Structure formats: structure tokens, C-alpha cells
């Protein structure tokens, strides 16, 4: 807006990044826009897809036909059978609930760390050439157009190139 770009991983999510799950927002003379990290997003989608299939590759092979019938002289037997059917439902119901609960905890942390990695993947490859703002964004000490923007996104950023004037701008 209307309020000055800048939301990073810290501060929140971006509705404007319809592209993928994790990604970059940029700001230069040419303009501003959102862009997903295809690599980071994919590794996650795969991870999460697998997580979901893991829970769903299960047992399942029936037919089983659960209904059973008993005399009025076989109440202990009926009851036995009832405790069994109940016992299994109790187990499956508890494991399921807790499984879901633990795997949701893990999933969200998984996302938080993927995004943090994307941050450090950049931080490490820029260093003194850029100021770490602290909102999950980097202010450049030099200039960087779309040619250079690709380089920082897909990890081919030339630090030795912009090494020079980054220093001169930094020292005031």
C-alpha cells in the first residue's frame, strides 16, 4: 500500500502471493511483485502429500460384516463381542485423535522452519551487501534490478560483483 511493503515471514502472510507457499516479495526501480520459491514450495507439498498418504495407507481390506447375533442364553458371549468391538473403536478413535493432533503440531512447525530456511538461504548468500531489516526483509546497500533479483531467488547471486559499492554506501 498504503503503508510501505515489507511484511516478511515475521509480521504475517501474503494474500498477494497466490503463486505457491513460500516465496519472495521484491522492490526496485522497475517495480514490486510477489514470487513463489518453486523449490521450497515443492519440497513441502511433497512432504505434506506424503504425510497425508502415510496416515491413509492403513489397513482397510474387508469385506468384514461386523454384525453378529446371539441367544438370550449367550449374553456373556454377546457381551464379550461388544467389549471387543468397543475396545477396538476406543483404540482407533484415541490413536486417530492424537495422531492428527501431533502431526498438525509438526506440520505448522515444518512450515515455520521452511520459511526460516528460505530466509537464511538468502541472508548467508548476501551478507554485508544488504541490511537485515528484522521484519524478514533485506534492504540492499547497493542496487539490484530484475536480472539480479532472479539471481538471489534461485541461489545464483553474485556477491563478489556488488561487493565494491555496497561498502561505500554502508559507511555512512
Amino acid at each position: 500500500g498504503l503503508f510501505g511493503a515489507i511484511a516478511g515471514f515475521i509480521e504475517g502472510g501474503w494474500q498477494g502471493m497466490v503463486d505457491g507457499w513460500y516465496g519472495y516479495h521484491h522492490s526496485n526501480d522497475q517495480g514490486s511483485g510477489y514470487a513463489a520459491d518453486k523449490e521450497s514450495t515443492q519440497k513441502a507439498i511433497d512432504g505434506i502429500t506424503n504425510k497425508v498418504n502415510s496416515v491413509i495407507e492403513k489397513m482397510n481390506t474387508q469385506f468384514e460384516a461386523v454384525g453378529k447375533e446371539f441367544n438370550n442364553l449367550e449374553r456373556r458371549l454377546e457381551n464379550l463381542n461388544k467389549k471387543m468391538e468397543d475396545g477396538f473403536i476406543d483404540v482407533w478413535t484415541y490413536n486417530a485423535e492424537l495422531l492428527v493432533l501431533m502431526e498438525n503440531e509438526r506440520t505448522l512447525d515444518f512450515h515455520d522452519s521452511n520459511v526460516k530456511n528460505l530466509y537464511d538461504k538468502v541472508r548467508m548468500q548476501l551478507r554485508d551487501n544488504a541490511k537485515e531489516i528484522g521484519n524478514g526483509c533485506f534492504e540492499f546497500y547497493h542496487k539490484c534490478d530484475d536480472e539480479c533479483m532472479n539471481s538471489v531467488r534461485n541461489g545464483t547471486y553474485d556477491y563478489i560483483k556488488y561487493e565494491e559499492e555496497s561498502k561505500l554506501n554502508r559507511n555512512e
Binding site: 513460500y22 449367550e74 506440520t107
Partner: protein, 326 residues
């Protein structure tokens, strides 16, 4: 003043998940793994329609209670649908030995062929027309269609003696009964002698029943009782009947004609024109999910029933959007 920023996706998802640490957490995407809906309809399983008894019970059907005449011949079945308390069972009051073991036998069989094994025309030294008002077909005393009530022919009940080699090439359910009259007068009226027996022999079966003549409450307006029994006659085995009175003999056996996977489900729903791999008393389940909570008493290839109201996996990000117009 040039800038790069690293962030994550948000959307207008309203969907909440729980975690071990946190509750009602809005996320961008979620996968429900708990099947909650059914179609409301009673359906065919693996193409086959189920054997739908209406008001009849297995005993009514296999004995051939008159009110069950619509089931004198019925095709292959997916599973058996029975009412919880069917009206037409034993028209003539009695009991059925090892009934539930029999009922369980039909949760693997999926078709009978009813073979006439002991035609009634060949009891030529006995009256076979015996019947009663409890099994009345429009006003007139009748009896179980598949059974024969042997009684004295003009002041005599000679020993009744017939066998049957199971040459049907498949395994065969044979049923029979013994009549337990209400008093000595009735026992003579019908069988002339007193202190009688019904023996049944196969290679493995050896029963011998004596009628228990006792006074007892009128069920369906009758005091007598008929206690039925059953057996699987193996292929090429013989079954012998011998009786000096009180035999309710079979006319038919039931060759177990198709095998496979069925069950009995108790419900008052009528069959409809639909398909499933999983049927429940409330309706059928179309799902790929691992759990359902619809109804424990399923038949078919079903998800694991659980006693849970919600199981939702987060797949997406924690949905924490941008203050618009950002």
C-alpha cells in the same frame, strides 16, 4: 532503498485445526480424514442386490412360512436385509435349534438353490396334509411350504422311514422338526401312539428326539410347539429319517449355490437403485478416507469406525493474512 522480502502464503480460508499445543488454529488448507456423510439409501454391493426379507425372518423363509411365499425363489444376494423384529417367523410357534449358527452360515453364502429332496407324494402310509390356523393362507389352515407334517392314516402311524443321498454336488442345508403336542389326546389324535421318537442320521449327525408333551401358553392361539433342527449334508453323504410319530419332515433342502462375502443387517429401509463398496444401516458410504463415524455396523470395504466428531489434518500454512490495504 531497494528491498527483498521472504514470506508465506495466506488466503481467505476460515478452516480451523487443532494441534497438541494449540486449538482452533486457522490454516490455509486442511484435509478432513473423517468421513461423516452417507447417501441415506439402502444399496447394492458389488453390483448384486441384497436379499431383502421384509417382514420375514430367516426361519420363516427357510421353513417356508406362507406369509413368505414371495421368497419361495430368490436370486443371488450381496448381503441379507432383515427387520429387527420380523413379523413372520415361526407361524406355528416353536424354536429353532442353533438358529444363530445358521444365520451366521448365511453371512458367507450368497445363493441357495432349493432342491426337492423328499417329495411328499412318497409318504404313502401317512397323511401329509396336516396344517393349522397359525399358518393360515387366506382363512384356510396351511403349514410351512417346505415342510411336511406327517400324521396317522386312518388309525395307524407306521414307522416313517426315508433317506436322501446328497447327489446335488454341493453342500446342502437340511432342516427338520419334531412336534411337541399340548396333551395326550392331541398326541393320539395325530399319531395314535404315545412315547414316540424322531431320529435323524448322517455320517456325522446322530440325533434322537422324543416329543415333550406339556401344557403351555397359547402363542398364535396354539399350545403345541415345533422344535426345528438343521444340518449340512455334505456332498454324497446320506441322511436318514426314522420316526414313529411327531416328525415334521423336510420336502426341500438348500444347496449352498454361491459362496462369498455377505452379512445380515438389521434395518427397515428398502433397497434402492444405487451402488457401494460399503453399506451401513443408515445409508451407504462413498469415501476414500480412513475413518468414518456414521455407524459401527457396516458391511463391505469400509473405513475404520471411530467415535469422533472431527479429524482434520493441517496441510497448509498458519493463515495469518495481511492487513489490507497493505
Amino acid at each position: 532503498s531497494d528491498q527483498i522480502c521472504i514470506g508465506y502464503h495466506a488466503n481467505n480460508s476460515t478452516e480451523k485445526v487443532d494441534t497438541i499445543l494449540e486449538r482452533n488454529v486457522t490454516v490455509t488448507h486442511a484435509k478432513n480424514i473423517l468421513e461423516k456423510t452417507h447417501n441415506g439409501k439402502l444399496c447394492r454391493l458389488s453390483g448384486i442386490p441384497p436379499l431383502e426379507l421384509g417382514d420375514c425372518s430367516i426361519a420363516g423363509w427357510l421353513l417356508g412360512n406362507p406369509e413368505c411365499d414371495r421368497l419361495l425363489s430368490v436370486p443371488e444376494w450381496s448381503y441379507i436385509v432383515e427387520k429387527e423384529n420380523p413379523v413372520n417367523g415361526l407361524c406355528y410357534p416353536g424354536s429353532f435349534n442353533d438358529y444363530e449358527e445358521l444365520k451366521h452360515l448365511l453371512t458367507s453364502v450368497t445363493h441357495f438353490e432349493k432342491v426337492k429332496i423328499l417329495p411328499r407324494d412318497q409318504w404313502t402310509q401317512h397323511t401329509t396334509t396336516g396344517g393349522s390356523r397359525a399358518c393360515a393362507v387366506s382363512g384356510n389352515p396351511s403349514f410351512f411350504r417346505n415342510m411336511v407334517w406327517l400324521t396317522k392314516k386312518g388309525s395307524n402311524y407306521p414307522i416313517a422311514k426315508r433317506s436322501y443321498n446328497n447327489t446335488s454336488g454341493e453342500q446342502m442345508l437340511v432342516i427338520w422338526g419334531i412336534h411337541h403336542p399340548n396333551d395326550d389326546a392331541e398326541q393320539r389324535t395325530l399319531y395314535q401312539n404315545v412315547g414316540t421318537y424322531v431320529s435323524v442320521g448322517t455320517s456325522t449327525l446322530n440325533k434322537r428326539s422324543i416329543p415333550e408333551i406339556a401344557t403351555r401358553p397359547k402363542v398364535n392361539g396354539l399350545g403345541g410347539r415345533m422344535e426345528f433342527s438343521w444340518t449340512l449334508l455334505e456332498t454324497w453323504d446320506v441322511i436318514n429319517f426314522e420316526s414313529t410319530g411327531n416328525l415334521i419332515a423336510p420336502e426341500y433342502g438348500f444347496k449352498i449355490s454361491k459362496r462369498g462375502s455377505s452379512g445380515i443387517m438389521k434395518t427397515e429401509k428398502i433397497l434402492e437403485n444405487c451402488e457401494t463398496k460399503c453399506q451401513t444401516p443408515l445409508g451407504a458410504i462413498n469415501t476414500t478416507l480412513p475413518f468414518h463415524n456414521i455407524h459401527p455396523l457396516t458391511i463391505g470395504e469400509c473405513p475404520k469406525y471411530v467415535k469422533s466428531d472431527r479429524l482434520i489434518l493441517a496441510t497448509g500454512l498458519r493463515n495469518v493474512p495481511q492487513i489490507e490495504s497493505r
